[PDB]
Amino acid sequence: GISRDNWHKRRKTGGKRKPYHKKRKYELGRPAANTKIGPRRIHTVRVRGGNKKYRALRLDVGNFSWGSECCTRKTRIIDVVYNASNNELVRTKTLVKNCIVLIDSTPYRQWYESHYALPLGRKKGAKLTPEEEEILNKKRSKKIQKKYDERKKNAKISSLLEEQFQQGKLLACIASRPGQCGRADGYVLEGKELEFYLRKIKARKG
Amino acid sequence: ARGPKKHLKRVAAPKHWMLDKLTGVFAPRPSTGPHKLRECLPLIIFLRNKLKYALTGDEVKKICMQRFIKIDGKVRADITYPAGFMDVISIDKTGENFRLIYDTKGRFAVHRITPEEAKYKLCKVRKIFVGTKGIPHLVTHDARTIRYPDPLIKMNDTIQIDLETGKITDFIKFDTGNLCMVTGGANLGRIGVITNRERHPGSFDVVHVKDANGNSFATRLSNIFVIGKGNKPWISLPRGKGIRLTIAEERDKRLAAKQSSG
Amino acid sequence: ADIQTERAYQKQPTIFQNKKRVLLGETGKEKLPRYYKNIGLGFKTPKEAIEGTYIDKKCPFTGNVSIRGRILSGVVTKMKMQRTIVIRRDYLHYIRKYNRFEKRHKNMSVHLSPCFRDVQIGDIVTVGECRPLSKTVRFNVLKVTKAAGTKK
RNA sequence: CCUCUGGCAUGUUGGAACAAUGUAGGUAAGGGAAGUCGGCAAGCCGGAUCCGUAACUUCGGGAUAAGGAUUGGCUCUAAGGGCUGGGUCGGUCGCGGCCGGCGCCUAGCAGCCGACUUAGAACUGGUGCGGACCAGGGGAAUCCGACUGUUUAAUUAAAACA
RNA sequence: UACCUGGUUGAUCCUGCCAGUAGCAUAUGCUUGUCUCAAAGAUUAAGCCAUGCAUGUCUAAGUACGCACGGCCGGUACAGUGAAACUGCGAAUGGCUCAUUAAAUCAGUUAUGGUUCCUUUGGUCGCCACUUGGAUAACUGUGGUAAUUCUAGAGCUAAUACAUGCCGACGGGCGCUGACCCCCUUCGCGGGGGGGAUGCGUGCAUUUAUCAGUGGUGACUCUAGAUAACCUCGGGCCGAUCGCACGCCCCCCGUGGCGGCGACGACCAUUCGAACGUCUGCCCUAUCAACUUUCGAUGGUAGUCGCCGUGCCUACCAUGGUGACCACGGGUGACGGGGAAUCAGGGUUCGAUUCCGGAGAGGGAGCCUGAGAAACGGCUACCACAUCCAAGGAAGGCAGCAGGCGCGCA
RNA sequence: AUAUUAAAGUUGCUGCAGUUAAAAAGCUCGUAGUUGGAUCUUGGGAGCGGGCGUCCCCGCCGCCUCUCGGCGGGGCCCGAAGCGUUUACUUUGAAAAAAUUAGAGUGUUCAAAGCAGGCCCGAGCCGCCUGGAUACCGCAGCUAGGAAUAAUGGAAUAGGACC
RNA sequence: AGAAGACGGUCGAACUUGACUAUCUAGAGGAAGUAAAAGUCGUAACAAGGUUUCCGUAGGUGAACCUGCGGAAGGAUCAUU
Ligand SMILES: [Mg+2]
Ligand SMILES: [Mg+2]
Ligand SMILES: [Mg+2]
Ligand SMILES: [Mg+2]
Ligand SMILES: [Mg+2]
Ligand SMILES: [Mg+2]
Ligand SMILES: [Mg+2]
Ligand SMILES: [Mg+2]
Ligand SMILES: [Mg+2]
Ligand SMILES: [Mg+2]
Ligand SMILES: [Mg+2]
Ligand SMILES: [Mg+2]
Ligand SMILES: [Mg+2]
Ligand SMILES: [Mg+2]
Ligand SMILES: [Mg+2]
Ligand SMILES: [Mg+2]
Ligand SMILES: [Mg+2]
Ligand SMILES: [Mg+2]
Ligand SMILES: [Mg+2]
Ligand SMILES: [Mg+2]
Ligand SMILES: [Mg+2]
Ligand SMILES: [Mg+2]
Ligand SMILES: [Mg+2]
Ligand SMILES: [Mg+2]
Ligand SMILES: [Mg+2]
Ligand SMILES: [Mg+2]
Ligand SMILES: [Mg+2]
Ligand SMILES: [Mg+2]
Ligand SMILES: [Mg+2]
Ligand SMILES: [Mg+2]
Ligand SMILES: [Mg+2]
């Protein structure tokens, strides 16, 4: 078939090898998943020794972990932004390991408003007036206020992230192998890496 | 080899099975099991070659399949069930009970034992574990995943397992001044107290063992297997005591038995 | 810049370069809390690894690569491959009929972590076998010597 | 080949027909030089990029040898350049200067400009794409004269002369 | 036994060969009373194959309403044989042959801390459940085709086949959340201590991220644990399962509990392995001296695929990699080895051939199932041979065992 | 008949030739290759054992370490470590499929084979006594001893130790 | 739940068409070699072989050969005052 195996290529010295037998079902490959953005479409695959490889062909959501604040809500994978293997895979919106995607900030927003009791994503007075006041409004006092006072300079979120939230899309690096596992579970770009990819993205745009 | 192998040529069979050239092209091939194929006494051989209890392959079958044979306390109707080292085979309708403990050649001597003694066995620990929720394990030499050991056993200690209940009932630690049988290579079925162990990091650990009768040797830890604290062991031993006469000494002892004794 | 000379971001794995909200500037003095390990067999992890800032997944100190099985020496012969060196192991092969030997030289392509600086050529270099990590390369360099002849 | 500037009235006439013969163009089923003194005539080939290139040889050539593939439209990607900018802190003098001290991008980074090419990729069309124009048919051998050159204005361009 | 004789000369001593001498296989000639063993289509043609046989299988314990037998008993399904057919497993072993294949296979050596593993053994296995849904095979009955181990339509009918799916379980236990409530102190904000309804989770496995460093090793990014979530969604998983033999006892009468096997599964260890890797080793050849490389050559970075580790493949970079220590190319009357023949000591030649390992089923290629094949006594194509056809179509592979043809000294 | 080995020291490592029998480049340089002079701890010392002393034999003078572990101060010397400067070399050990070979035992009637056999016993024993050895297994890889031979190092525009 | 089907991808037999390479062969004519043999021409060589032979290199000749130049002793002089 479409075989992974050294037998078919030249030696370190450079001379030709010879085929001492025919191909072997294990000296095997398969055609690539190259899973896209879209509403879920997965295929399972019988592999060696029984077992199953759950090949994503389309995908939409993913379980991305904001590391620094520790929340890891499920979210949309809105779009692919950058992929340092090959540009065309950005253009296609093909999802791979170490793809830089975008994800909606909304569950991280919801979480941060919950946790630190602060607004995230600046606005005039539309989100702040009805919902955040209701999230606040301390009928207990004493205990909960002391807690969220203890959530101190500690809230002080990164600048680059804060901008992304107020826009609404977070750059997130995929850690899973979508074609193999099926999922697209990754993590949010933060600080040094984020700054690096943002620059690489700026350079790409020209 | 398109998959696995389901046969075993005679001649290609293990040497210590005593299997002769003309009889058949094949040997049984022990079933998959606790012991390694090339470390076994396939129940059939143990009977119709070494107890003469059956004549044929068919006769062993018929002995086995009245549920007469009882390999480390259970019952097994496979004729090719690999019995091996420190096991039992209780045969019941006779009250024989054996053990399979190596000879100083290295052949598993048909070693009769008492019905008390035939309760416990002995086992080498292969690997201590820690599985889920912190619950530790052992694994014996003969594939008994024990769970919850005395937090002290670690690898190469030997244990006295019950059998019928299962579970560990006290043990021996691998150290100098402990009786060591070897279960592999040149010095198979020799026994002496230890003396000295030598850790080679990455390579494997050479171990010296001094026989009762002044003689000494070495081995690689794997084959080694302790059987008690110092001179006194924790089991029966076949006559010979795992002591390894020189070929000259053996010939003399054979010569002295002849003519005089009768 | 400097370290990130590549298209994707290079980081050591196994550390999370982020958790921070306290006084005394942004991050610590060492800044990135470096990952490293010791390789064993009494091979001393170098200062250039632990003090050093570089990254390399195939470095047997500062990355995913166990050392296992055969350990040898060679002598550094070509340094041109990036992160790697060819080394010449030489030996005396016995013919029996003629009760003599012959020289024979196998030359192994070998991974050379950037922890090692000042590796001239002609430099005897211990290598420890590992899992393969290139078509041809399995052996990482573990300790280096140089002193056979020219200078410290 | 088509166009503007400028220039003309189709080259000493017009009209109506659309026969044969012609002159100048084209096209032809099946065969493919059977035609003929003789492939004469016409046809094939043709650009570019990428491969690939024999005998022979004066070693320079032969050579665009031969023989192959690709070519459009559309939407993208990558690769190739210039200019200018830090002397920031302190002092003092009139955003600018002068002095002293740091800095000293000495891996450079930042902003502002501007031709044009080359490679790669997607999609797309009734496989069409060097769409007209332009633009080698090759091969094996023999004879002659080395070659480039010259020659009978008006029947001989050659192997003749040089 | 570390053995030499004949032959150049008119004769001599030599170099030197030829010729004899002794083994060992293959053939062949002549010949052959007895007996124990015993090779045998390798060499030529991995040439072609008439016929037949060479892989099937049922226990007490997976589904029996064939009506094919019979029970002993009726009527409470079932009782005992049981072809049939569905179900499961096996068909990857064995057997053959040596075409290929020259650092390849192969041997010793190690690694898998870079993976898969049917089984075997041992661990794990907290409102349809007094047990649910519909489907089909045999059996029945109409057929169609010239012809095949072709099959369609109609009737039914079971399952451990295929599906669906609950009681358990403690409004209770532990994480977060916390309507709130209570005690102390304080001028009071505040500070400290407690308790606490209502919510969400209320994990073995999966995928990702963070934290901490029970048991381990030359050796962790190991095991184990904690937090955050995710479900590789019906085609993640066990979650929670059918069958057989005895037949027992309830502070109690119609119920509720009970031992002994079978079979089944997700995970972990074991075993049988497999697979890739490490080191060192192979015959002739220079009338093979340079080879490899944008069609992967050697490295790097990030992926892709794969059971996993690697140019395995893709992108982007770097310009490496092998060579007189013989690369690279060519040949082999070349499968590797264990081993065999000779032999004083060295050696030389052989090794198709009963063990081990490889490779192949005319040739090439592709795949289905399956734990395991790139299977050939499995398919799908093509090429080469060839077989019936009612000429539309249909079928085929002895390098299994016999046997045939051919080739051939064999 | 032919293949092949010994004969063939007519392929030569052991082990041949090269004045004239076949045979040494016309000559010199010359890189790979191969081959390379001498040189560093020794006599002695002290005992057990053999033929007051002499001549032959046998354990000792692996050093340092105590920076490390222990079989409010310590000893005692073992695990670790400056591992043997870094190899070759040699010896021991460990690992090595079986069959074949070599080779123990054993009257297959003998033998080539085979792996068995043998007894007590009137059988009353209702059996018993034994085998199914060892050797070899290039090279490479692994272990510990030895340190002559041969390489290979270190202190020379200076460096070893020292509350 | 899902059959036939088609877009593209992929592995890729197979056939055509070159191309290079190994083995095998037909060939007028040419030109060698060996062998038979009861030929023909001469006599080069071995004796100072009747011109020492021989080597290298040139040219020539029916043929062996001859001649030129520089070598050789394997010479017909180890020696010449
Ligand atoms: Mg020799
Ligand atoms: Mg006109
Ligand atoms: Mg006009
Ligand atoms: Mg005019
Ligand atoms: Mg025409
Ligand atoms: Mg004509
Ligand atoms: Mg004609
Ligand atoms: Mg013309
Ligand atoms: Mg031409
Ligand atoms: Mg001519
Ligand atoms: Mg001319
Ligand atoms: Mg003219
Ligand atoms: Mg003219
Ligand atoms: Mg004569
Ligand atoms: Mg002869
Ligand atoms: Mg087989
Ligand atoms: Mg395994
Ligand atoms: Mg051949
Ligand atoms: Mg075989
Ligand atoms: Mg055939
Ligand atoms: Mg096969
Ligand atoms: Mg096949
Ligand atoms: Mg067949
Ligand atoms: Mg010979
Ligand atoms: Mg001889
Ligand atoms: Mg000679
Ligand atoms: Mg001569
Ligand atoms: Mg000379
Ligand atoms: Mg010397
Ligand atoms: Mg005559
Ligand atoms: Mg002569």
Domain match, B155 and B223 both: no
Instruction: Report the chain B residue with the minimal C-alpha distance to residue C68.
Output: B202
Residue A204: CB less than 7 A from any atom in strand D:
yes
Counting the structural domains of chain B, the total is: 3
Contacts of residue C52, Cβ cutoff 8 Å, sequence gap at least 6: C62, C114, C115
Would you say residue B74 lies in a domain?
A: yes
List protein-proximal bases of chain E (any atom < 7 A from a CB): 91-95, 100-105, 110-114, 116-124, 178-181, 190-192, 194-196, 204-211, 214-221, 223-225, 227-233, 235-236, 267-281, 291-293, 296-316, 318-330, 346-348, 354-361, 364-367, 369-376
The CA B82 to ligand 2 mean position distance, Å, reads 114
Of A178, A169, A167, whose CA–CA distance to A37 is shortest?
Answer: A178
* Claim to verify: residue A38 and residue A140 sit in the same structural domain: no
In a domain, B82, yes or no: yes
Structural contact between residues B225 and B172, judged by C-beta atoms closer than 8 angstroms: no
**Coil, strand or helix at A174:** strand
Does residue A87 share a domain with residue A66?
A: yes
- B214 & B232 share domain: yes
User: Are B142 and B167 within one domain?
Assistant: yes
Of A22, A43, A18, the residue nearest A32 (C-alpha)? A43
Count of domains forming chain A: 3
Residues A204, A125 share a domain? no
Same domain, B206 and B166: no
Q: Is the CB of C67 under 7 A from strand E?
A: yes
| Phi, psi dihedral angles at A94 (to 5 degrees) | -105, 135
CA B249, chain centre distance (Å)? 26
Range of the domain at A160: 106-168
Tell me the resolution in Å.
3.5
Question: Between the CA of A16 and the C1' of G21, what is the distance in angstroms?
Answer: 17
- Is residue A62 located within the same domain as residue A73? yes
**Alpha helices per DSSP H over A123-179:** 133-135, 143-150, 159-167
- Sheet (strand A169-174) strand order: A79-82, A100-104, A169-174, A186-188
B14 shares its domain with B107: yes
Residue A25, both tokens:
């079902």
d(CA B156, CA B163): 20
Residue A74 shares a structural domain with residue A159: no
Query: Which structural domain range is residue B167 located in?
Result: 121-171
Element (H, E) at C101: strand C101-111
> Nearest CA to CA, how far is C37 from chain A (Å)?
24
Phi-psi sector, A7: left (phi>0), alpha (psi -120 to 50), beta: alpha
Same domain, B69 and B100: yes
